[PDB]
């Protein structure tokens, strides 16, 4: 059963700004490593240490496929990659540091949208 039209152009919205947000200074787009994880064969020691593997890809598949039925679902995913990448890159780290800020940005573009 779809979602009210309204909520899955919310979602793709919300996404769509997490995803091409840019660094002020450096002006990248941090996202950018978080958008499709690498494979169980190319990082193996990644699918073992992170229970729930998720990016961005797979985030917008969902939104295409109504499996989130509100934003607090889409939310979830969201607050999940980033803490996977909380998890297994080091605190201080670049990576780690771009996952607190792309969490913001969520928070942030969701009050927005709202």
Known sequence: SPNP???TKKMKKIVDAVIKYKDSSSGRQLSEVFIQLPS???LPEYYELIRKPVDFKKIKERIRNHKYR???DLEKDVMLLCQNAQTFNLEGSLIYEDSIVLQSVFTSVR???E
């Open 40 to 42: 169980r064969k190319e």
């Open 5 to 7: 039209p309204n909520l």
């Open 111 to 113: 009050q927005k949208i």
């Open 70 to 72: 509100s934003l607090n």
